[PDB]
């Protein structure tokens, strides 16, 4: 088992590495269709790289690279999309937001750190399972928490795994930077969940629409961090149609495997989206989801965050293009 995964570790040790500037990840509508889990892990190395965090927080080298590969192997392989590739798109949106979006001139590097680590810990060791499934399939982790249990578990495994061996990038942090780190990451991973985002977002939009937002008023700023977090948690929708076909029809088939679990180990009367029958009407039910979080968040992420506009546009392009499959 592990012998093959560590053979993949030699694939890290013995394969060509295309540059991130060659691999279009700065382009928000990037083609992740051709990347392997290894290459996406390498892009994740870029995501820890350019955010000026390793210099500001003294991250260890290979401990970080194999932070990335360990989080890579830890995902259960039965899962469709909600694996390492999900973290790839999420922290793609995060890295792109904090560099291509050029927000660093605004918000502090501490916050860049919280944004990045919470972005890669938006969905650690995701089991093809959202909060509700364990809330009703009753995995022990569910009883271990209450609200946003997968994400309370993602903060739990943030503070745990980063303190766990092979992952101590927090080791170089000063106690203040470390404190702001795990705390802002706590609230943000709570907000990496789209839900507690829906909870926290209203104060943000009230503080954004009037162009009265200010970064010398730090709680509002951290709230912006959380908004970017949730903006990143669903970033897979930003991808191009030949690819997005794969991505959101794996949203289809993966919530249809999870939905098979919703109609075997759960046996609920089917809801329209995760019912397989609506293969020709699922995408509209994505839109009602997409409008519920994506566009609403990327509008504010448009009026404040700037170059991050395509992160909105790269989603909207899918709309009618999925409506086509939603139109049988």
């Amino acid at each position, epitope marked *: 088992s592990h012998m093959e995964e560590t053979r993949e570790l030699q694939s890290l040790a013995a394969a060509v590495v295309p540059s991130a500037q060659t691999l279009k990840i700065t382009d928000f509508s990037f083609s992740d269709f051709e990347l392997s889990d290894l290459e996406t892990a390498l892009c994740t190395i870029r995501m820890f790289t350019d955010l000026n965090l390793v210099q500001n927080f003294q991250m260890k080298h290979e401990v970080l690279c194999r932070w990335i590969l360990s989080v890579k192997k830890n995902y259960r392989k039965n899962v469709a999309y909600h694996n390492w590739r999900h973290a790839f798109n999420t922290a793609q949106c995060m890295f792109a937001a904090l560099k291509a979006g050029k927000i660093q001139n605004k918000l502090t590097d501490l916050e860049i750190l919280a944004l990045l680590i919470a972005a890669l810990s938006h969905d650690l060791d995701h089991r093809g399972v959202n909060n509700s499934y364990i809330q009703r399939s009753e995995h022990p982790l569910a009883q271990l928490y209450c609200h946003s249990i997968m994400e309370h578990h993602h903060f739990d495994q943030c503070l745990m795994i980063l303190n766990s061996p092979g992952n101590q990038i927090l080791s170089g942090l000063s106690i203040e930077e470390y404190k702001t780190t795990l705390k802002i990451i706590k609230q943000a991973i709570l907000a990496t969940d789209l839900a507690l985002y829906i909870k926290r977002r209203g104060e943000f939009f009230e503080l954004i629409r009037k162009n009265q937002f200010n970064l010398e008023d730090p709680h509002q700023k951290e709230l912006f961090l959380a908004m970017l977090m949730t903006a990143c948690d669903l970033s897979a929708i930003t991808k191009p149609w030949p690819i997005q076909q794969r991505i959101a029809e794996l949203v289809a*088939t993966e919530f*249809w*495997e999870q939905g*098979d679990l919703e*109609r*075997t180990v759960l046996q609920q009367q*089917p809801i329209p989206m995760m*019912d*397989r*029958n609506k293969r020709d009407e699922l995408p509209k039910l994505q839109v009602g989801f997409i409008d519920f979080v994506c566009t609403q968040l990327y509008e504010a992420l448009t009026h404040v965050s700037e170059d991050c506009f395509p992160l909105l546009d790269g989603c909207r392009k899918n709309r009618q293009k999925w409506q086509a499959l939603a139109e049988q």
Partner: antibody
Amino acid sequence: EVQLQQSGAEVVRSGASVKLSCTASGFNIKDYYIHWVKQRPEKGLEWIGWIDEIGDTEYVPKFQGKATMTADTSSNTAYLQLTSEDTAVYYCNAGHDYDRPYWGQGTLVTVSA
Amino acid sequence: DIVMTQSQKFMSTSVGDRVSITCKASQNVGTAVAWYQQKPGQSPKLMIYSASNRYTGVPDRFTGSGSGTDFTLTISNMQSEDLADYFCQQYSSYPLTFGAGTKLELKR
């Protein structure tokens, strides 16, 4: 060898419904699509309808309003409640759910008054 | 929809001869193709899946391919057991459709 199985040759009276079966074996259909089909002799195995892991029945219009499927995934079974062409060999198969391979003998129904 | 017509039915060819069980999709199906070993009054077996990949337990002497539209189950090293029905199927698209069947015959 992995195999589906069904009732053998039967001679029902005209106007009398005949309760067909499709007992899959050698694999759980608990994760699989199941597809009923008809064979009027030496012709295309004309389609009847199908059922998914969702457990909801589905029919061809030819058998919709006529045929009455009752199927279950954990039981790996698909019943099919039901002319000289209907006097036929009814087959049924399967498919992986992630996918977009085994058969019963084909129930030889014979309808005549 | 996509009918799986088979012009092949009752060819009379000698044992060990190569033979082709033609079939034809009316529309594109991709590589998602499934050949089958039918018998009257008795259980059919799978022959081929994914255009090329073969059924578990059927002999490899058979060949079975074709894709998109044109299809052909070219039985090779044909035997008397091979002289039974065969039908093409798409698992590619709903409703699934099926071959006319083809009861191969030994030549004499």
